[PDB]
Amino acid sequence: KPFKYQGLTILVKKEIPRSTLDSFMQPFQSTLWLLVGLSVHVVAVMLYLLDRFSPFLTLSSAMWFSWGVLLNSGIGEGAPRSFSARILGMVWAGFAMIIVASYTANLAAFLVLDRPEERITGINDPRLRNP
Amino acid sequence: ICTGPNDTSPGSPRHTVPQCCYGFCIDLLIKLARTMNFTYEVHLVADGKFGTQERVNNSNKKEWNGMMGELLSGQADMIVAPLTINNERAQYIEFSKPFKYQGLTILVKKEIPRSTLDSFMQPFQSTLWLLVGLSVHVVAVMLYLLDRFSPFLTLSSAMWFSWGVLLNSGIGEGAPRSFSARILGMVWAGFAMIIVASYTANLAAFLVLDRPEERITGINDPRLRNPSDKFIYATVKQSSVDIYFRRQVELSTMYRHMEKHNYESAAEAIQAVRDNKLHAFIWDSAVLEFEASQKCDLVTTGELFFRSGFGIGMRKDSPWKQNVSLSILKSHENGFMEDLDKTWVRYQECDSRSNAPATLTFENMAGVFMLVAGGIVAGIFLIFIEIAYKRH
Amino acid sequence: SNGTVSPSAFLEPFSASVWVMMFVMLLIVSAIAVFVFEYFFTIGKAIWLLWGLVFNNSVPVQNPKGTTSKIMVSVWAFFAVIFLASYTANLAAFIQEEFVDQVTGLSDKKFQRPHDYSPPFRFGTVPNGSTERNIRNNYPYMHQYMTRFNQRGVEDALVSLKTGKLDAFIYDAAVLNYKAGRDEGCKLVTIGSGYIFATTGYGIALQKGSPWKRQIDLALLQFVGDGEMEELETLWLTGICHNESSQLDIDNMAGVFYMLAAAMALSLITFIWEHLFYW
């Protein structure tokens, strides 16, 4: 009579997550990073360019405002004074919110680079069925 | 012009009255009549059964009903109908090459998401909502007490700070002065962040109800393999599907759940599924997908099983076999049949079928619009309250 | 195909009716409210505060001083955080790389008219088969266009289509389904998610008036009814890609960049408008 009931099964090596120094930068492509970085600066410059020539917000104030609203920090307590500057700044803040939400929605997914490629679904799995 | 029974209800006088018929089978028949020189005379069936080998009460003799009952008796000699090809029917009468390749499928209710006003508050329980509503006030009050009795932030300012911390508003202006309060404010802010993160985490599932049971998976669905008294599914009595389910060796058990709910016709079963009387309907894929496209609240599941074809039934000893076979196949090879599918079966009124998550609409968060309207109508009264307070 | 993402994909989470109702009507009602509650702080400052509060990004604003206005702002901010959580709950799934079919079907104008395109569309079939007969008897011109793109066999056609030598391969359905299932990397797919034109089947050939026709027909029908065909096809004809974490490019974020470009354009237009107004 048997003294131990068991069966055939598959052993595989656990691919331990190896996190690179750029993993958090994986969700956004490098070209997108450069483009958004240039967009931050161009928005920052156009805000005070529009504000200074308003008959009705300096360099540092405008750039701090742009960077803070992009990062949700509140570093610069300087709001634009002209109307079209108000609309431009609020759209800039909305775009910042959208982009940071998109980054959040996939940051943790790319922070851990684990995929079920090494997982084996018994003997009916294809990679074992097909040599 | 088709002469058929007037009333389909059982136990009613059935008199042959001529109605007018038109459809895929009808214009397929006219295609045959144009390609092959012959005259036709279409008439309906004495009953609403496709055909099933049945025992008669006297002498226990086998007989066929419906199409093949009429055909073997000489009343009719050729059939244009969605007649499935199977072993049992092919033994006595002969079928041409299929004019529609299709399998078997399950039709169920779409079960549109239930929308309620209190959907957004579902994530947290009512007790937890009340407890956090008390917690914001109590944290505000001992912040006020700590700052007021400092060794070295008024009540209203304390409440504004607490509320603007709990929900991101910026209303609270002025950090606590005393060091004792400046740590409790920080930990209360951490608690508020935990609360808002927990609310954000899974409010989407509560806003739009999921489909734990609606997601049927072929015949392998647990409530299909093992039928209970709560989930009732049936099909057309005395048809191809009944014979198929009677033939399998593993499914016999659910066939015993199947025999006591069979409907007389496909339309009746479809209507029963429509008004939440029949949970699921087993039928051929073509009719079910056409109904799902047309009836917008009905949905197919997939995982086709028992793939077969609709064929032209005819007598075992007839000379039209080869002619109709070549004619129907020639209709296959040229542009005729896909044109017929485009004209009669290939048209959608709604689809709403995609793998993407559902698009949020009015009813999905009507609750938050009602909440902001209630906030407006509450403010329009608290203003008179505060004017009276300032009067005092 | 590589595929693309529609620029309006990030507006898809909420219907346009919801967007216009909340962001025009409800927003202005709340703003004019808070203004008149403060009266009992320009309306522009009010709408600015509401806009900044809808999507909190530490935007500098001037908070109202009234108690009732503060209650109004708090309830609006609760509404706004609900909106943000709902919008970002399924934003990742909505912004997904969808794969569009370049050919709608066998009747597509690309097949009908291959010359009127900058690239000559490269598509053909293996000769000596029923496919060429159907193509000839249905479409002679497109068959004589086939003649210069004929492939030696199925494996040659597959290896040519993997590279840029060919664009489409037309042949009977079962073989292509098996190849697509057994394809490595799932880089080859049939058009129309299983579009079938001839919708014919495979049969057993017999001599004219053969006595074996009846027995063979009964045997095949019995096998079909008993369900053997199911495990026979899932043991041989089954596939791998059947029943089966991506970076974001400029094309994925094309809509929001278009939105900001339109914002810059309208800001310039408003700049001109206010210069003429003050002039």
Numbering used by the authors:
A (entry chain A): 531 to 586, 601 to 675
B (entry chain C): 435 to 586, 601 to 840
C (entry chain B): 540 to 579, 599 to 802, 808 to 842
Article excerpt on this structure:
Canonical N-methyl-d-aspartate receptors (NMDARs) are glutamate-gated glycine-dependent ion channels abundant in the central nervous system. Their activation results in excitatory currents that underlie synaptic plasticity, cognitive integration, and memory formation. Each heterodimer consists of an obligatory GluN1 subunit plus a homologous GluN2 or GluN3 subunit, such that functional receptors comprise two GluN1 and two GluN2/3 subunits. By comparison with previously determined structures and together with our results from kinetic modeling of fully liganded receptors, we propose that the gating reaction of GluN1/GluN2A NMDARs involves at a minimum these three conformations, referred to here as: primed (closed-pore, all M3 helices straight), engaged (closed-pore, only GluN2 M3 helices bent), and open (open-pore, all four M3 helices bent).
Presumably, the reduced likelihood of receptors being open in nanodiscs or detergent micelles is a consequence of the absence of a bona fide membrane bilayer. Only when all four M3 helices adopt a bent conformation does the receptor transition to the stable open conformation.
